[PDB]
A paper describes a structure:
However, monomeric and heterodimeric types of function unknown aconitase X (AcnX) have recently been characterized as a cis-3-hydroxy-L-proline dehydratase (AcnXType-I) and mevalonate 5-phosphate dehydratase (AcnXType-II), respectively.
Therefore, to elucidate the catalytic mechanism at the atomic level, we performed a crystallographic analysis of AcnXType-IIb from TkAcnX; the small and large subunits (TkAcnXS and TkAcnXL) showed sequence identities of 43% and 37% with those of ApAcnX, respectively. The crystal structure of TkAcnX in the apo-form was elucidated at 3.4 Å by molecular replacement using the coordinate set for the structure of AtAcnX in the apo-form; recombinant ApAcnX was also originally prepared, but not crystallized. The crystallographic asymmetric unit contained four TkAcnX molecules consisting of four chains of TkAcnXS (chains B, D, F, and H) and four chains of TkAcnXL (chains A, C, E, and G), the conformations of which (except for the chain B) were very similar; r.m.s.d. values on the Cα atoms were 0.36–0.42 and 0.29–0.37 Å, respectively. Small differences in folding were only observed in TkAcnXS; the N-terminal region formed an additional β-strand (β1), by which the β-barrel was created by nine β-strands, and a shorter loop was connected between β9 and β10 instead of α3 in AtAcnX. On the other hand, the heterodimeric structure of TkAcnX showed a more “opened” conformation than that of AtAcnX. The electron density map and anomalous difference Fourier map suggested that TkAcnX has a cuboidal [3Fe-4S] cluster. Fe1, Fe3, and Fe4 atoms were ligated to the protein by Cys110(L), Cys342(L), and Cys283(L), respectively (the letters in parentheses indicate the location in the subunit).
Numbering used by the authors:
A (entry chain D): 2 to 130
B (entry chain C), C (entry chain A): 1 to 386
D (entry chain B): 0 to 130
Write the structure that this text describes.
């Protein structure tokens, strides 16, 4: 069990997909598909839809929060977001899209493919082995 | 972050999904910068207005918020709009219209301090455009952070901001001294100087010595550039800034700007006239005497421009140029004054290929878009123009 | 007053009868207030525009001076014009033309700090009308004497004023401390307080404790009112004015303004609605938020006015309220935004016999001229009106 | 003989007959620019002319445009031959300059009464009393 902060509540379980690079939503993620578009992200072609996203911090344009909202309408949104440090772009996106977010977690202890449960109301991540 | 018993009810949801989710945003930025409480704001400025930058995901959000009843509780204006073919404009008018339904002054200028909205010294506000923020903090003494698109709107809805950063006295103290040893006399000089200081400085609050600007527009540009090659949200000029007396309260380092520093920037923006098919002045949006200058210059030239000149301006300024006769002198020589639009934020990529300008901000963004650019003063751009 | 060798050429007519006489006036003033030298001004505002004021005598000098070859050497704007029958108006436009022929920006407003000419903190200027001078000095921290009509014109032609009075750091220091115990929160309350403080003070520079105005416009009013009843060209509001920390530099007496003081002025301008055939809002010239206030007020009234409503405002503000649909709303109900004009300076004694207003300045002048007056906030005025 | 010393505001010399007022004269609407007849609600002097007389008064008051009334006065020849103010403010000195009306201030106006013949050397700020 890894402990973090309650950014946005809710509970979710899914497949962990990890980025070790600052991820920028305006440009680097497609609102229609959920596929990463960033030229040099780890997951150049992987889609976020219905997964558990892990990445150190968001970056890029303040507008990126709106992309995350389009992902949630277009139903290609992640089930939950695990950031190293919660910032304005990603948190606002989860707040307006009702996506559960928990930051301050050791994101290095999460590798791609892990089955994982996030209780975002209390801000805790549990790895299922 | 402390919340008054009224504020927790807005978060509890008493006043609608709109104010709740807006308050939810705010209490998340406060919990990021450690604001003590929420402080009220006297005005706002919402970023994310161009269809180029907010796209369809933009009109997505704004559609659903207009639906759930979001209105702004404090007087607020808009970032500039874009310019494009009639598809782009329809979507652009949709964006403007959606903001209008939220009770926003659809002024769409980066210079609301001309006519539209002029903050008083010491007023806490929630502004978002970088060039406009640099003006409010440095040249007017008003206090605002460099807000984002969604946060400027979220603050505009509730009427408050997290109390952090540039709202607090101690974060308005200078962090570095800038000994401007170079010759800095003209608009382009303050353009090319701001490009430098902005690029070499971090998140600093620079203090300028040896800087006597003749026109306040020079400091409008000096701030716009630093906010484009860096993140300078507030600077002090000795003897010219309203907060400059109490600025330096501890031992500061002094970087100096030599002429070689400014020359290097000039020569990275020296493209031939044969690579230019547009002149842009008014970035940030021209003041009235800026428009006056350009008109009196086309006077002496006496022949029209064979590549088109654009002056991007607030509608306030554009209106005076109309009524004072400056526009008629401009449109007669192929110029045009574009109210409340912005060019570095319009999908102009297919239309033009080279921008001559006097703005350091425009030069930097157009160069990094792939356009050829040629940076000089307005008097030179108009003399040598085709 | 020390004169440069060039200034002492101009004094000897080396540059024309127009510059000579301009310089001749400026040295007579320096010799009266013991100014050390002539300081350059960055802009200027010229008084003596309405034909009711300067009259045929005014046109005579203005005419001979333009024929002598007078031209302004710095960016200068104008004071508001008059309104009257077309026989009058034809004469007025002759005044405005002469000023134009001198190179003046014909913007005819007392709020040029909205779009037209926004001075920077510490700029030395030559402004001429009381409400503007108080605003630029107090709320902007720029420096200018309460120049007269001719003194500002000469200062605008040479490009310099005598360096006396409010141009000097020691003269901007506070004279009295004003403790406002009375309830002062509405626009009209700052009108009525400015009335009282100007009438009871002398040539003081007050220092306001316990004053926290919501809208900057309240201080725009506050200064204007004090400039009518008294002779206040500069004040300080603790926390709101940019110069307030350095204002006090010795022991000062504290005068106090109680609710009894203010009621006695609110109640002096309460003539019946049946003696009121006109409403003036926009003294000083309304801001855009002031107009937007009046617009949304009539939308909730539903029905038009049976007496005319007049919103005097700068050209810049009008053209905003036009493009934003505010003047379209204001005109559907019986209202009109009158640009770049002023009523207290217009020969309207035979047109209307009673003004209702939210301005304390107009309430003061119109009462003395012999009109019925009625002083209240716009929200109350628009509701109660016929 | 009894020379009264004052300050130079506008040069020139002028002799002639006096009119004196111990009240702040206002020049905007206080003097009819056609006649030079003093028309002010409050005044020592109402309905008396100024043309070709030495105008002794304590200070100018009223509106700053009054200088133009003086400029019109002079070009109508209904202006005073000279002006002995006690204290030079910006209304009357400005009007003297644009009108080329010889002016002197700083004189003790109590030693002047209405009717006394006088010459004013304004180049030197002097006031001889011809008898
Ligand atoms: S938004 Fe405005 S400040 Fe300049 S870069 Fe564009 S014209
Ligand atoms: S000039 Fe302006 S300040 Fe009031 S008295 Fe006239 S509207």
């Amino acid at each position: 069990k890894l402990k973090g902060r309650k950014i946005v509540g809710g509970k979710a379980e899914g497949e962990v997909i990890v980025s070790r690079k600052p991820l920028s939503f305006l440009g680097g993620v497609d609102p229609e598909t959920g596929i990463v578009t960033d030229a040099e992200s780890d997951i150049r072609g992987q889609s976020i839809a219905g997964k558990i996203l892990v990445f150190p911090r968001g970056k890029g344009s303040t507008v990126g929060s709106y992309v995350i909202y389009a992902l949630k309408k277009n139903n290609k949104a992640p089930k939950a977001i695990i950031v190293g440090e919660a910032e304005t772009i990603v948190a606002t996106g989860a707040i307006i899209s009702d996506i559960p977010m928990v930051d301050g977690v050791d994101v290095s202890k999460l590798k791609t493919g892990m089955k994982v449960r996030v209780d975002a109301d209390s801000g805790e991540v549990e790895i299922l082995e | 972050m402390y919340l008054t018993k009224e504020e927790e009810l807005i978060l509890a949801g008493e006043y609608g999904y709109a104010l709740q989710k807006a308050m939810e945003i705010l209490v998340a930025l406060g919990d990021i910068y450690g604001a003590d409480r929420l402080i009220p704001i006297k005005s706002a400025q919402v970023a994310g207005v161009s269809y180029k930058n907010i796209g369809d995901a933009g009109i997505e959000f704004l559609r659903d918020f207009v639906e759930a009843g979001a209105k702004v509780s404090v007087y607020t204006t808009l970032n500039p709009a874009g310019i494009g073919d009639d598809e782009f404009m329809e979507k652009q008018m949709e964006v403007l219209e959606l903001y209008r339904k939220m009770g926003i002054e659809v002024t769409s200028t980066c210079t609301p301090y001309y006519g539209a909205n002029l903050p008083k010294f010491g007023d806490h506000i929630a502004w978002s455009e970088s060039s406009a923020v640099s003006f409010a903090n440095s040249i007017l003494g008003a206090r605002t952070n460099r807000e984002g698109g969604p946060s400027s709107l979220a603050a505009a809805i509730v009427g408050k901001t997290p109390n952090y950063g540039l709202h607090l006295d101690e974060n308005r103290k200078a962090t570095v001294i800038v000994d401007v040893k170079a010759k800095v006399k003209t608009f382009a000089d303050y353009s090319v100087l701001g490009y430098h200081v902005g690029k070499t400085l971090g998140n600093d609050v620079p203090y300028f010595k040896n800087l006597k600007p003749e026109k306040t527009e020079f400091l409008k540009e000096l701030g716009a550039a630093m906010g484009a090659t860096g993140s300078i949200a507030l600077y002090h000029v000795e003897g010219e800034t309203p907060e400059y007396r109490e600025a330096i309260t501890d031992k500061l380092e002094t970087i100096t700007v030599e002429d070689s520093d400014l020359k290097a920037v000039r020569e990275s923006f020296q493209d031939d006239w044969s690579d230019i098919d547009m002149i842009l002045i008014g970035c940030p949006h021209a003041s009235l005497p800026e428009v006056k200058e350009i008109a009196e210059l086309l006077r002496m030239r006496g022949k029209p421009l064979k590549i088109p000149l654009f002056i991007t301006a607030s509608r306030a300024v554009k209106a005076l140029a109309d009524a004072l006769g400056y526009t008629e002198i401009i449109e007669r020589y192929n110029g045009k004054i574009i109210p409340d639009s912005c060019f570095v934020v319009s999908p102009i990529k297919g239309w033009y290929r080279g921008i001559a300008t006097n703005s350091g901000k425009s030069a930097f963004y157009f160069r990094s878009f792939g356009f050829s650019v040629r940076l000089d003063d307005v008097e030179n751009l108009i003399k040598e123009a085709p």
